[PDB]
Write a protein that binds this ligand. Structure first.
Ligand SMILES: [Ca+2]
Ligand SMILES: [Ca+2]
Length: 231
């Protein structure tokens, strides 16, 4: 394990209810507060009235707090996809993935086919498109994706497959931002098309990685290393 970054300040809160896919209500001390949710998943196991979450302030505009994660086995599971992405960016910056040494992000959200993928990364010998996905659904030692059907994700995997068949470099990285997981697999029930598409991706040449991450109550974000991938 090693430290990537720190989030400050971090406020414990009580999760009250999800208003819609973008917003939740939480209790912070005396106050009921609107908190941004940046994760399109159901997060049914986390979004339970009474559960302890962790928020950070947001300077402007619509909402003043971001719900970053939830208490999970004494640590914090990171649900916020923006934070997960920032953690990934630190991994790239610090060159902590040997295969991506000497590589850096040159474009964020470039258009690819009918969609956009997270990153275009430039290396010494060429470029690589990298899509990162949240994997915070737990089954024992596994982090899983997704927790419900994702058309957005089906599209992304299709564009990755097409890149690889065109002989371009393509990668999907699952961010297993849960403490105490050592492996990754697709949650077939959540989206059987995605599980089928990930198999097709492997065969086509799309590189698949999964990373273990969590946040400590201190705000420190910890990179545990890679998770064992099953597809
Ligand atoms: Ca994206
Ligand atoms: Ca993404």
């Amino acid at each position: 394990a090693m430290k990537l970054m720190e989030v400050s300040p971090l406020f414990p809160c009580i999760f009250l209810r999800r208003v819609n896919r973008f917003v939740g209500l939480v209790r912070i001390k005396e106050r009921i507060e609107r908190a941004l949710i940046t994760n399109t998943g159901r997060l049914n196991e986390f979004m339970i009235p009474g559960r302890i979450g962790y928020c950070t302030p947001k300077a402007g505009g619509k909402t003043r707090y971001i719900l970053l994660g939830f208490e999970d086995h004494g640590k914090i599971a990171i649900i916020d996809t923006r934070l997960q992405g920032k953690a990934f960016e630190k991994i790239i910056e610090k060159e902590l993935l040997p295969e991506l040494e000497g590589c850096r992000i040159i474009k964020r959200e470039p258009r690819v086919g009918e969609s956009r993928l997270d990153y275009l990364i430039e290396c010494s010998k060429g470029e690589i498109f990298v899509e990162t996905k949240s994997a915070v659904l737990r089954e024992g030692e596994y982090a899983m994706y997704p927790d419900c059907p994702s058309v957005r994700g089906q599209r992304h995997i299709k564009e990755l497959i097409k890149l690889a068949r065109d002989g371009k470099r393509a990668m999907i990285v699952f961010i297993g931002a849960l403490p105490n997981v050592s492996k990754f697999k697709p949650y077939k029930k959540g989206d059987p098309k995605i599980a089928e598409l990930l198999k097709e991706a492997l065969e086509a040449g799309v590189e698949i990685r999964a990373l273990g991450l969590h946040m400590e109550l201190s705000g420190e974000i910890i990179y545990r290393g890679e998770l064992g991938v099953e597809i």
